[PDB]
């Protein structure tokens, strides 16, 4: 079956810069009638996909002339001459014949300067402990790029079970990212140990960014 590969998966650019996304079919997608049915769709978050380009290089009505497409047989490309704020979202190439198949999508986002995360650790609340639960929360705010790793440690020993992470979408004002990492234990298990550590490894730092607390 035809496989549609899109590169890159994520594409950070400043507003004004040019953008170029690539799409590759595992094999020629040329129809017998001679026409190539390759389309490009843009999906802004919380919205339905909107048609951009059809038949490899044709622009749908109402699409800005910044958008242009090209390619032949196996390799296709969508170029944006000048990225506007309204162009941010996920781009999908679609194969409209034989067995319609979408590409994995390329997320166009904003490029900004690096920013180290501000880490904050929070012990379980008294109200939660009273109920037999123990959630230790760690906020890692305003960093860039989005790639980051968080390791939890209890009394020095690493802990992987019970962790729940969540990332916000790129900040609409400063273009940074934030994430939350929660470690849930039982009040008993929580009380059987003294030190809790939340450490982050980000490119803006050679050493890990640590935040710990002793429940005693």
């Amino acid at each position: 079956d035809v496989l549609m590969t899109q590169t890159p998966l994520s594409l950070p650019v400043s507003l004004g810069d040019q953008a170029s996304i690539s799409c590759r079919s595992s094999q020629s997608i040329v129809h017998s009638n001679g026409n190539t049915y390759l389309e490009w769709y843009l999906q802004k978050p919380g919205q339905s996909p909107k048609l951009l380009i059809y038949k490899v290089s044709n622009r749908f009505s109402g699409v800005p002339d910044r958008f242009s497409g090209s390619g032949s047989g196996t390799d296709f490309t969508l170029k944006i001459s000048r990225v506007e704020a309204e162009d941010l979202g996920v781009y999908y190439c679609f194969q409209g014949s034989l067995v319609p198949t979408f590409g994995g999508g390329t997320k166009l986002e904003i490029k900004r300067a690096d920013a180290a995360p501000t880490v904050s650790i929070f012990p379980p609340s008294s109200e939660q402990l009273t109920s037999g639960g123990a959630s230790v929360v760690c906020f890692l705010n305003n960093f860039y790029p989005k790639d980051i790793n968080v390791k939890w440690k209890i009394d020095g020993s690493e802990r992987q079970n019970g962790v729940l992470n969540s990332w916000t979408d790129q900040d609409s004002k400063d273009s940074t990212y934030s994430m939350s990492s929660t470690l849930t234990l039982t009040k008993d298990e929580y009380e059987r140990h003294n030190s809790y550590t939340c450490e982050a490894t980000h490119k803006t730092s050679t050493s890990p960014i640590v935040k710990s607390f002793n429940r005693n």
């Binding site: 026409n35 049915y37 389309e39 769709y41 999906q43 339905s48 996909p49 909107k50 048609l51 059809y54 038949k55 044709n58 749908f60 996920v90 999908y92 679609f94 409209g96 067995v99 319609p100 198949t101 979408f102 590409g103 994995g104 999508g105 501000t118 904050s120 650790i121 929070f122 012990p123 379980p124 609340s125 109200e127 939660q128 109920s131 639960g133 959630s135 929360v137 906020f139 705010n141 729940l164 992470n165 969540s166 990332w167 916000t168 934030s178 994430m179 939350s180 929660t182 849930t184 607390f213």
Partner: protein, 216 residues
């Protein structure tokens, strides 16, 4: 003016079936292929299958054969799709979209999507726990909304007076129940001097909780 009005959000149980509609208007419903697209939360777009309202010809993605069933009531100019044997992987937003004939030869019109949620969990009200600093001209406070179903909850700070420095992290399913958190960053001369409260509303359970953030 072509419009594709889809049916509302659906909450279903595992193993059950869900029949969703897509009312087509502004064009000859029978003259065009109607396509169905799936989008699991945070994943890409997947093509399910298509149907030709005129003669009821249908084509399916091998993956959704004997899973999804496309039908149409040309009289009502409405297309239907029924997804049976519901599992957690069937939770997603499903779009119906028209494939244009002459000129564009692409999916020019899309519906707004129908969000389906497949869970055996019952309406469970949230546990709102205040996150205070461990016992720096800025203080980061938090609020943990743990164990609720279904989405959504609405979290505010000081009834909405506090809009700056807030990061509300998207909810995450931790074994059939959702968890969400939020952080607010204020100067050290604001808290604990002045009061900072976390307001949580969970519509489905008629719950409205306020949680004052108090020092340890």
């Amino acid at each position: 003016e072509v419009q594709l009005q889809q049916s509302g959000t659906v909450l279903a149980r595992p193993g059950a079936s869900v029949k969703m509609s897509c009312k087509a208007s502004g064009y000859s419903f029978t003259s065009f292929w109607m396509h169905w697209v799936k989008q699991r939360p945070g994943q890409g777009l997947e093509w399910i299958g298509t149907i030709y309202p005129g003669n009821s010809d249908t084509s399916y993605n091998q993956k959704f054969k004997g899973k999804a069933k496309l039908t149409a009531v040309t009289s009502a100019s409405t297309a239907y799709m029924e997804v049976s044997s519901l599992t957690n992987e069937d939770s997603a937003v499903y779009y119906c979209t028209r494939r244009s004939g002459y000129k564009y030869y692409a999916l020019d019109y899309w519906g707004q999507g129908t969000s389906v949620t497949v869970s055996s969990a019952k309406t469970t009200a949230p546990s709102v726990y205040p996150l205070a600093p461990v016992c720096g001209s800025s203080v980061t406070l938090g609020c943990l909304v743990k164990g609720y179903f279904p989405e959504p909850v609405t979290l505010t700070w000081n009834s909405g007076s506090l809009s700056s420095g807030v990061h509300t992290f998207p909810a995450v399913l931790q074994s059939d129940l959702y968890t969400l958190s939020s952080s607010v960053t204020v100067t050290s001369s604001t808290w604990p001097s002045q009061s900072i409260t976390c307001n949580v509303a969970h519509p489905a359970s008629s719950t409205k909780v306020d949680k004052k953030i108090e020092p340890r």
